[model samples]
Target chain A: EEKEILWNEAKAFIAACYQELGKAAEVKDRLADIKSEIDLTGSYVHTKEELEHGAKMAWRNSNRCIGRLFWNSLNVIDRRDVRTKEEVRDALFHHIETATNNGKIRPTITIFPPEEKGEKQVEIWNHQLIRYAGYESDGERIGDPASCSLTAACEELGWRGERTDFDLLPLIFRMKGDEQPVWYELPRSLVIEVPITHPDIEAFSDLELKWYGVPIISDMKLEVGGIHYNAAPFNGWYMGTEIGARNLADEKRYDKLKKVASVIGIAADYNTDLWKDQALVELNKAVLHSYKKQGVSIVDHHTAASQFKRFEEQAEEAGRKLTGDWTWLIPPISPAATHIFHRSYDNSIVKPNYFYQDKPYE
Target chain B: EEKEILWNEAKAFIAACYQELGKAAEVKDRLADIKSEIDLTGSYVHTKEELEHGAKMAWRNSNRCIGRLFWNSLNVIDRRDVRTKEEVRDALFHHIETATNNGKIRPTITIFPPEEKGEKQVEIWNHQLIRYAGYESDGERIGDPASCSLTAACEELGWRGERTDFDLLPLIFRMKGDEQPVWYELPRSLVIEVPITHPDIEAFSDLELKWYGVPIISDMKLEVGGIHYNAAPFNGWYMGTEIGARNLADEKRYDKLKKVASVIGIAADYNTDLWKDQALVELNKAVLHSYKKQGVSIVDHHTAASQFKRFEEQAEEAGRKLTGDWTWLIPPISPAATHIFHRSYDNSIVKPNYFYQDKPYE
Candidate 1:
């Protein structure tokens, strides 16, 4: 029964991938080989071309992503043969450095070893390859409270941060048959940071807010053609709201709205003064301005939503059914002002897509 | 099968309503009468108490409404006996005046006769009892574009407006077995309008923006224990965003963001300037300020969300499962700042709820 389901998934994926590439004639031969290979060895391998295109297809099929317009331009780094923990660490460093591209970020992914015999050969424990450490000291959250759980696990593994709000956490990973997790600090030269400041509000500079230039999500499992790439880390350029509206402004995260409101000279009453709403827009403006001034690749929510509308038009032209998570597709701030907020979306998950996996820590 | 379904719905509603009202002992008697009534006449009728509590329950069960915090305090006017078009018009006028309450708006509903043999005995042709006329003259759309279709229908029925941005449309309705619709012009004494102006931006008043004091939704059908009140019009106090962020700011509606942005000295570039978002906030502030200054009752999004949080707490204390439509519950602007935006909801519709029906005019 398991083999039957696997063969069906493989056949469906091969047919879709080859048809999309306009190589429909090759689909039958590829499926026949994959069927026999899976029947004999309990698995099949994806060729380099298949791996690259499959990664792009996974990105395109991501329901929660608003940046799928550039899915085809993703840079796929096939590091599937790297088996050692040391090799995996080096590959991750290379990915960060190359994807950062001196602040002009690129959409990139690096696929490590896939699961074998229903067991993952390698795993990256960090939610993102680049993230700050969080600490809970004397009833005060020092950094991102979202990272506190992973930070605790890293500390248990003998990793210590500088205890600052923006201190970068070390990457945590494990190889096949390893009893303990491995940690490695990223070199400062490889990670780019953008300091946030408002264009017209000089007092905003006194807040000393900063964020990383690129976002490399490292934990989600990539599924393509019934095969799971468990250690695939990927990234795209930042959308300003991810930093301003959520990361820095969410009450559970950095919670900076009150602080920013004080600097903007607005009263702290969220109801009558609409201080949170005003501060939220200013923070977003600062993020976009700072990122642009530093020559980092970033799109504001309005521009990104327009690009998404273009993506929808292109998809319609190509006769493809567009699927999305409306909750995630709409921008966090001033959502109704955008076209996306007016429409609904089908959230059906398609094959050759990324899926969330259990966190290795807890 | 139809009778079975109706009985099931009736029994479930009786159990829930009686339980919530602390009259569980009466549930068995109510279900016995309802089952016999359905067996004899193919439908059941709700008593005055049942109708009143059922209307409140329907409001509580409205997934798209954010003002359910006052669900128990709704004033239900029992007008289920009015059968003539003239009588219906008078009752509707009374509803408008009493619900308006000289700017201290009250949550009110006036339920007419229920459907018999799956046909509506009475139908309201207007989407709302009070709304502006929309005219597509030459190449431009004047007034509220949302009202264009209804406005056209009213015009075909011989109702004419002054062709201004704020001309009030006449009420249109049809009585039992009527072959044509009837129109009634509301008295100026009964209909109240508030002129919109900004607190700090003096030039904002030059736009001459205004909206109705009360919004009486006249199109939705109210369901109560398998009975359908097809001509039930309802009203609640305004949430400022409903006017500023949506009615005035939606591109398909009044589309006033650009005009407000120009008055606020912001550039037209939505990407860099985020003029739409900025204008949206200012418009919302003006709405709240204007309504409060004129002694009208309105709540801002932030306060409304906080009240919803309290509603959730109260529901929990009452041992009731809170259900909601997350998309509708979240405020249009700065949605992520609200607790509702961060959570998921069960949209499984319960019985005794308000539902959309085919427009009587269209």
Candidate 2:
């Protein structure tokens, strides 16, 4: 039954992919080969070219991503032959460096070995390849609160970090048959940081806030043509609101709205004063300004929304159906000011897409 | 089949309403009477007390309303016996005057006659009981763009207004068997308008902006105990962002962001500079400030969200399932900063409830 399902998925993906690539004639032969391979091994292997296009298609079908306009431009690195934990860590470092591109971020992904017999062979515990450590001390949480549990799991595995608000967490993962996960600290040279500063507000620099340039999601499984790459990590340039409005501004994360409001010389009244809303705009402006000034590639939510609109138009022109999670697509600040807010979307999942996997830790 | 469905709905509603009202002992008698009435006629009528509680229950089940915390406090005006168009208009005018309550706005609704043989007896042409008129002059739009088509329809029916940004449109409606709709102008004394001005930004008053204090939705059907009130007009005090972030700031509506940005002494850059977002915050603040200063009741999104949280707690305590449309529940500005934005909602509609009806004019 599993073999039958695998062949069906492979057949559908191959037919669609080949047709889209304008190589429809080759689809029948490819489908036949995949069917035979799946019948014997229970899963089919993707060719290098197939892997590249498959990753792009996964991104294109990602309903939660507002950055799908650059889906076709994704750079996929095939690292399927890496068999060791060290090799997996090295490949991730390479992914970060290559995607970072000295702050001119590129949309890139690195796919490791696929699962064997429906079991993950390679598992990455970190939600993202590069994320800050979090710690609770004396009723105060330092760094990203979203990373607290993962940080504790890493600490349990003998990993330690300086108790700073911006301490980067080590990459934690394990290969097949490993009893314990291995952790590796990312070298400073591979990680680029942007210091947030408002262009018009001189006092904003006093906040001493900084954020990593790239956001490489490492935990999700990238499935393409019935093959699951469980250790696939991918990244695109940051959208300003993701860092400013959500990461730093969310009450559960950095919780910086009150601080930002104070710096902007406003009383922190959350209701009628709208100090939080004012602070949010300033924070977003700072993120965009800082990224632009440092030559780090980042898109403002307005531009990203416009690009998504263009992607929608292109999808319509190509006679393809576009699906999206409207909640995820809308920017957190002044959402109604964007076109995406006024529209509805079908959030139906499509093939060759990323799926959340169980956390290897906790 | 329709009768069967109607009786089933009535049974369910009576059970729920009686149980909640702590009059569960009366449910059996009420259900028996309703069943006999339904067998005799196609539909049954609700008693005065039942009508009042049913309307409150409909408000409670409204997924899109953020003000449901005050659902029990709703003042339901029973106008079910009004037979003429003039009476319907007068009732609506009375609703406006009563709800306005000398700027201390009240949550109120007035229900007219229900459908006869599944055909509407009373139809309201206006989306709201009071909304500004819109006109297209030369290549530019002169007023609220959302009202353009309706304003044109009213003009075709021999209605005229001064070409101003805040020209209040007259009430347009029709009773049973009317060949044409009747248009009635609201008395100027009954219509309360709040002049918009910023607390700190002195030049904001120069824009000459004003909005109606009460938002009375006039064209929705209210269903309670299987009976449908087709011409139900309801009012809840304004939430600042509905006017500031959407109605006034939207490009398709007022498109006032750029103008507001200029007033705030900033270059209007929709992308990087985030002038639109800043203007939106200021606009929201101004709306809230103006309403509060004018002694008109209003709610900030934050306070409304907090009230919703309290409502959720109360619902849980009463063992009732709370459902909501998350998209509608979240405010337009600084959405992620609110607790409601972080949570997901079921959005599976419950009954009794209000439903949209077809526009009688366009």
Candidate 3:
């Protein structure tokens, strides 16, 4: 029939997507009802825990850090001249804006066995948490844009050089191929940019970080018999590449083969811009850098309280919406080691403690 | 007999958990590296798509509603006159710290969803994209004890309480059995306890908002599901009697409960002594009370790509670990049809464009 499915099915899919889109609109609306006031006094309310945790964290963050933030930071700027909180904040925002305008000044380090995939997810979530946490009281609408203003105020305050360090969540690392594809692990990176806002550069200067190494999420591969390999890179890439090519088909300078050959650094007869578009974001913090969301292959732990024999059927559901091209390289979670178990653990790559942890109930 | 998960399966299960945890650690580490700086320049090194998307997103974020943050910010007072960045910084941090000592300001909103699950491997891989875009900076540690000083500075600077309205993220709707239960989505409130920076709580008294919703994250419900029929009406009398018995587990407290029961009022049976052991906090504002991390149910969403399933699992894991005489009801992410989901979308309780969404691709 059609390249897709039934006409009704297609129509229904469109309709459902619209419904979800409508839901998206609704989510934006419901935010206003949540007022900033309500008296909840109890040790059991989750509300209190955050307050407790936040206070303690703030105290520790400010009192002990080795450097300065905005005004007087953890760097111990032995300045009796600085006694107010406003000065500090102004300085902090100024530093941030300055960084944003400077192209890019972030050091990226990722470690992995490729077997553990959750590194990237945590990476993003960590930033998300921080974004809505510290200074922005308003949602993204006001919360984000105001960053520049805060920067301006800080700049005017004459505290540009007061910043000391950028406390960051650790980058993650993991494996790539299943059943031991050469080395079990590899590394990856991505590019990101920020805008500069000062009395100075009204024109945003995009800064980029050049990361050496693959620095990203990659396709999954598995050993079928020892001699054979089954590769399942995300299907989205194929579609993505095609879409890029179609868009540039009229451009004589666009060369798919050469482009492809240029990227993946292999002599492949295809797609450079398209390759850049599809995956592999490299450009030393270029405004356009691709980041990889690698996989987390479990090695040793207790499986759920059940057992299943067939592999394909078990993987079917996961395969359909497999967040990425995944290589099921381990025997799942268990206490003992065996051929069935392929997952490995690298504590250096992933350290789960106070620095990075999930709230018990959250 | 010991939770007899087949050895092979158990191996895989443990592997999965460790992999996730390990990858989370890696993500944390890589994010930490952000301060190190990465450049997105030429040569495809990683997921450049992320670079492309991030650029547009950063541009959009920096351009959007940042003005509200500035407009409603406490710093506006400082903006009244042309001052240096140092002056602005001093002003903002000064107000932030002052409010912090007040112990009753819900300055920011934080939202969390069920942890990502299913694809298992790829999610970890894809977690590191936005390490620097948001709050991973050294200065803002949301729940840790280290954030206290910075908070003090923020309160004093007045960058905080401008009445700029960003909706609170009341994503988790919780309730329990026979215990008088309600299904309101509670806004995340920052409990401020303005520190006594200048021997003057009165100096900061005027800063408080006169309205009811001015200084805390309000507690409201989304009513995802009706209470079970078996649940008794939570009216004062019925709950008083039941709560009395539960509280009177200590013989000495029986008489106290009986006395309080006679008086007509809402009661709190929390272990105040135990809770007080928690460290003080500066959660956006001052909270005389310690924060709680109580167990709550997850509302499941059944989409093919849903976070509910993951949340439900974590909730189960929480229950399994904290097992005692008491147990809590749990669900997955809010179901698509529920008011909670629709409302969350409306209020930005959860957004599709969230930064650092835990990696799902493997």
Candidate 4:
């Protein structure tokens, strides 16, 4: 069933691309090749046009991405030829630098080799190439709890950095059934961090909160028209809520809202629900303020949603059906204020989109 | 076709409610009555049990209500006996007083008579029975733009208000076939309002922003077992953003963010994106703070979203599919913090739901 789905995906993708690129004759030729490959290797390789368009289309098809407005502007770096873990590490760094673009964040993706012809599939274990480490101690979780397992895995690989809140996890990747995985530390110069502080409260600065600039999700497979780029890592700039609300404010993560709530003097004694809400506003305010103050490109959910609305309008004008996961398109903060909140969407998983792959580590 | 649709809706609603209430025999009896009603009038009147459950279900079915966690707790005031315009004016006030519940805002519904047998359908012209008047003047609007049309209608009926930014819109309603509408000023003594003030900034109090306690939406119809209650006004407590981000902050409405941005000392010329976001956060904070201080019931979007998740969980445990309009379920503020933003829902309109009726006066 999986093979047949892949076969159908490939044929449809090739046909769409060839027709779009005005290579209709080649589409017929390519589709004929797909059947032969389906019986042998299960899926055929995509040509450059197919590969590039597939990446962009997959982005357009992604359910959880609010950044799909810039889907056509993606820089797809085809590292599909690279197999060794060392080459993978260098490509990952290259992706970071290219995506970072000196804080003027650009959307980018690096697609690694796919599984075919008795060859092992390459996979990256990290959720993102850049993340803070979490260390567990005697009745204390000192860093990000979300990163505890990854931090442990990297430490198991004999890589030791200071077990601080902002320690970047090592890049861990390996081919299928490899004896051991390879890991590499991200260079300090390449990674950018924003220190968060609010305008109203002076004491908020004392909490010492910070977060990374880019959010390159590495684990999700980029399935484009019958092929799965299982190691395709992609990212756009951070929406402030990703840092302020989830990373810094979530209970299992940094969980700073309670302390911030206390500092802001929210009356927790009376069972008033305002404490968390008030603290969250400040935390998010700090993130947006800090990012703008530092000249780092970060969008608030408001701006992102507005831009997405513009994307939808233009897409409509172009006679394109704007497919979206209504859940993913909405910003974490103040979603109802955004135009997206009032709209319904068909969340059917379409070709050339992101999908959760099986985790490399249990 | 429409009659058949209504007949089917009547049968389905009767079945669902009776089955849930553990009255399986009554379900069969009610279904039989619905067929006779369909043969005669194309719809059936709900029994007391069906009416109450249907109101709760309608509240649950509201796509835009974040307050659905308290669905079953709603006060379903069966004002279906109301006939004259004077009765509507009194009933409107009754809804306000009852739903207010002395600042512990209650989710409520008041079902008026549906259109039938040459009898005019009763309809409220104002979107909310209590909303500020919006008078567009020489490039300087006096109040909410969202209320301009209703404000004009009130003026047409020879009702004059203080012309302040917070002057309550008059209750305007007409029977479906009536030529003239009735308008009445809401007695200020009965209305509950919160005077917004920031905890930190002293100057923030000078803005003089105020909003009513209950958002009794008067326009939507409560459709129970295919019977439409055209004058079914319902309400929940204020979600902070409804007043702060939208009523006061939206550009098309009050557009106060620029004034707030200046007072907050946001950099005007530096291309700082934080200006709007920062101003918005402070404005929202003031709303949440003041509401708590005044003992007016209000939920921030975060709290509302969290409660909605709980609603979803309880529904799941009861082995029922929680149907929702994804667009409506998400709070306007920080939507991603709530579970709804990260998930998709089946938005297929279920029976016993609230629906937008024909505008009382377009």
> In candidate 2, what are the lDDT values of residues A1-362, reduced to their tens digit?
77777787888888888888899999988887877877677777888888999999999999999999989999989888998887888899899999999888889999888988877788899899989999986897788888999999999989897889999999998777888889998899989999999998899998999999999999998988878788899999999999999899877889898889888899985578988888999999999999999999999998989999999999999999999999999999878878899999999999899999788666
Clash totals for all candidate models:
0, 0, 265, 13
Candidate 3's error at A3, in angstroms? 10
* Candidate 2 vs 3: which has more DockQ: 2
Please provide TM-scores, in order, for all candidate models, with all chains considered together.
0.97, 0.98, 0.16, 0.83
Give the per-residue lDDT of model 1 (tens digit) for A50-89. Answer: 8999999999899899999999999999998897888999
TM-score attained by model 4: 0.83
What CAPRI class is candidate 1? Answer: high
Q: Which consecutive 10 residues in model 2 chain A have the weakest lDDT in total?
A: A35-44
Better-scoring candidate (DockQ), 3 or 4:
4
Instruction: Give Cα-based local distance difference scores for all models.
Output: 0.90, 0.90, 0.20, 0.78
Give stretches of model 2 more than 4 Å off.
none
Give the lDDT of residue B229 in candidate 4: 77
Kindly indicate the candidate among 1 and 4 with the higher TM-score.
Answer: 1
Candidate 3: residue B346 Cα off by (Å): 6.1
Chain A alone, TM-score per model: 0.98, 0.98, 0.18, 0.92
User: Per-residue lDDT for B84-148 in model 1, tens only?
Assistant: 88899999999999999999999999999898877888878888999999989789888988888
C-alpha DockQ of every model: 0.82, 0.90, 0.01, 0.26
